[PDB]
Amino acid sequence: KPFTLPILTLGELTNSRFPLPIDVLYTNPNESAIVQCQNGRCTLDGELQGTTQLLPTGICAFRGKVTQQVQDEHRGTHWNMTVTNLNGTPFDPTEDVPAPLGTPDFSGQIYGVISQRNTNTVPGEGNLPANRAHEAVIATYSPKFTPKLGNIQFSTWETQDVSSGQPTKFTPVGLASVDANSHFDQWTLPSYSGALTLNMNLAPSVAPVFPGECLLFFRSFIPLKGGYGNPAIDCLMPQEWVQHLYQESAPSLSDVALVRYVNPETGRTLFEAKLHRNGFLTVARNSAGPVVAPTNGYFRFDSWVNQFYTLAPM
Amino acid sequence: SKPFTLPILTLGELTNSRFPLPIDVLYTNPNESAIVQCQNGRCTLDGELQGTTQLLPTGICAFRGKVTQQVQDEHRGTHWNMTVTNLNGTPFDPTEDVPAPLGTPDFSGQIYGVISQRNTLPANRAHEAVIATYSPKFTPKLGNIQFSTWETQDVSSGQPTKFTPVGLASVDANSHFDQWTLPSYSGALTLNMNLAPSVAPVFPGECLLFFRSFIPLKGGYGNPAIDCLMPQEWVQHLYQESAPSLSDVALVRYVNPETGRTLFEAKLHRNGFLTVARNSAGPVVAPTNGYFRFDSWVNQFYTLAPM
Ligand SMILES: C[C@@H]1O[C@@H](O[C@@H]2[C@@H](O)[C@H](O)O[C@H](CO)[C@H]2O[C@@H]2O[C@H](CO)[C@H](O)[C@H](O)[C@H]2O)[C@@H](O)[C@H](O)[C@@H]1O
Known part of the structure; x- marks a missing residue:
């Protein structure tokens, strides 16, 4: 061929x-x-x-779920999120890859948008889920950047409106x-x-x-x-x-x-x-x-x- | 064959x-x-x-161009007029047999994304932005569109501008x-x-x-x-x-x-x-x-x- x-x-x-x-x-x-x-x-x-x-x-995208807000010395509001494979299946750390496919491959502050669509729907809104999105930064050089362990940390300017336990997407846009x-x-x-x-x-x-x-x-x-x-x-x-x-x-x-x-x-x-x-x-x-x-x-x-x-x- | x-x-x-x-x-x-x-x-x-x-x-649903000036609009937010070029940076020719510059959104809605600028080391800025494609100010075939920001001031006129789509507002x-x-x-x-x-x-x-x-x-x-x-x-x-x-x-x-x-x-x-x-x-x-x-x-x- x-x-x-x-x-x-x-x-x-x-x-x-x-x-x-x-x-x-x-x-x-x-x-x-x-x-x-x-x-x-x-x-x-x-x-x-x-x-x-x-x-x-x-490419440089993540899928997963926010676990909780966390503490970090750096300016902004910080959040931990578990990451899955991009197709939604659980990431298996024993697989022969460096990290989930699509993980960024360079040191820096990657700027993008975190968005969420809740799993639970609300009867008062036609059985539709609540949503939010905010600008976010992922510092890939941070000790909290551990995608091969199944979780990473991102920061937001937004101080409050990120939900724990909800499906979360990172859309990359540039550098911070x-x-x-x-x-x-x-x-x-x-x-x-x-x-x-x-x-x-x-x-x-x-x-x-x-x-x-x-x-x-x-x-x-x-x-x-x-x-x-x-x-x-x-x-x-x-x-x-x-x-x-x-x-x-x-x-x-x-x-x-x-x-x-x-x-x-x-x-x-x-x-x-x-x-x-x-x-x-x-x-x-x-x-x-x-x-x-x-x-x-x-x-x-x-x-x-x-x-x-x-x-x-x- | x-x-x-x-x-x-x-x-x-x-x-x-x-x-x-x-x-x-x-x-x-x-x-x-x-x-x-x-x-x-x-x-x-x-x-x-x-x-x-x-x-x-x-x-897809991207724009390239330059902000001309801040403008006023009934919609919530701060509003900006932007000329658009072809995605490759060449001037958009309205006489071409296309509906609009290639990549232009093809549906009615409020498209949410990020506007970023790199000035002609250069200064930079980026902000969340919304493009209402149903607006009378959405005129990509005429070479310009309008976007809104939550940001009230820091959008520069005459500077290279990119819209990266992310979702809906x-x-x-x-x-x-x-x-x-x-x-x-x-x-x-x-x-x-x-x-x-x-x-x-x-x-x-x-x-x-x-x-x-x-x-x-x-x-x-x-x-x-x-x-x-x-x-x-x-x-x-x-x-x-x-x-x-x-x-x-x-x-x-x-x-x-x-x-x-x-x-x-x-x-x-x-x-x-x-x-x-x-x-x-x-x-x-x-x-x-x-x-x-x-x-x-x-x-x-x-x-x-x-x-
Ligand atoms: C559903 C809700 O959406 C977002 O908040 C919206 C906000 O985008 C819009 O500008 O203003 C409305 C208020 O009229 C917000 O919706 C309320 O948010 C409340 C929580 O802050 C609560 O959910 C009410 O039921 C909504 O009507 C998101 O920012 C928010 O997290 C949530 O997903």
Whole structure:
């Protein structure tokens, strides 16, 4: 079964690490951090890895139930919630995953909305449940962020109107802050089971192996609740590629596919890249920053090569 | 002839094409009195997007643009006029043969979400916001809409602005939630244009089959839902494949892959919607692992096995 990529321009792609459109292709050869994100991880033959799942609505989302209001030193009102799998089934910590699928894979203050629809209905309102929603922040670096143990903590500006024991949804929107005390680092994994435990069942780190090559990312800019900043989230492959590879499950005929970024109008190749078996791209480039390319461009599979193939310089 | 296919995705692997929500259940309502003519999640079986349908899950009920100024309105809150562009940032051209910018909401109600701004390091702000799509100030086809905030002051004019949808503000009577009532995209007293066609069963005993999602509420009593004709992944798949339609009606089977058994069959119509032979309203209670598989091309006279 021939390997294929979908035919989608950057303007038709979304980020696999946060619910955002892809804005630009991006490189940063001098990156000092280990790149080991857990969302948007899929092998070329269709095996999802890390915390990766298929739903665009599931990325950095949580489902569960608030247990109670809790105490925390930080400003705001704090709440504990148990989390389930996104499909509502109980999360089994013995499963070979780092955390419930969809769990955020970076350190920071994730801003979004907590909403609730009560289980109990009220006769005075046509047997319909009561509802509420409020802005919320989940600090993934907090010792109380323990999704692999089945519960996390979120804060609200709202001081009162969050109900205990009721079905609860977190819809991610952006970051609360990227100032020094908000610990935003897109390549630092949360400690899924708490302070000082080792994460397990991780998708592997990724890196170029050929001299002169660097990782190529699909970059999205992420909204901020407040403060100064222009934060971005870089994924290895867009969510549509994860979805495509999963559907196709085409056998990988080598460890590296040669792909070309093409301008369909001219038919000309804008640059070429290596698409590695574990599900990431490298290019021959010696600079950091956006890849300035025609809007109509997209990657096309060329052939299976090997790790010694020399890419044409971007 | 390139064979027609559907993706292999359980309900738990599908998302709504009319609001950014997971699909919760399959659903029927044979006694529905409204004309079904939604504009998002519209795609022919040979891959032609229609109405306001676009490919991004992040674009559904989203807006991009710039606030012009604070304005006044009868509705509760503080109100803001915003010009809207295409979701890709290019200027929206009202002369294009679309009902409204792609992604524009296709139903009447108070849509709740978050407005965020990043100034042209830049300063930022975000606030809860509501867009009343039934309002005379909801004029996306004219290039501008109005949103309200609880926040009274800190919304900046002339700055890049994003609306991220989250749910509904209310489904009280005065919030005019009706998922089958289209907004007037050019405002009061104007006719919508370039619409995807209405859909309906034509065969006796048949009813539409929907992919249903429950939509969050900011407050109040209710259990509102949004029904789409096909999930967003089907729109994305059909667009990619562009397989020729060999008749007006495809026969599809909802299969349990474990047992291999067919749970029921349905008609998948050329314009991009499903019908089944069912005489009841409510969820289709089916195993979690089930999904639709293309069987064969049939015609309008094919008699579906009763569900
Ligand atoms: C059902 C209720 O909805 C929300 O409170 C609403 C609020 O959104 C609206 O603006 O004002 C009404 C009051 O007229 C609020 O509804 C009352 O909330 C009470 C509790 O605060 C109580 O439930 C009354 O029966 C409601 O009429 C939510 O904020 C609230 O938690 C609750 O789900």
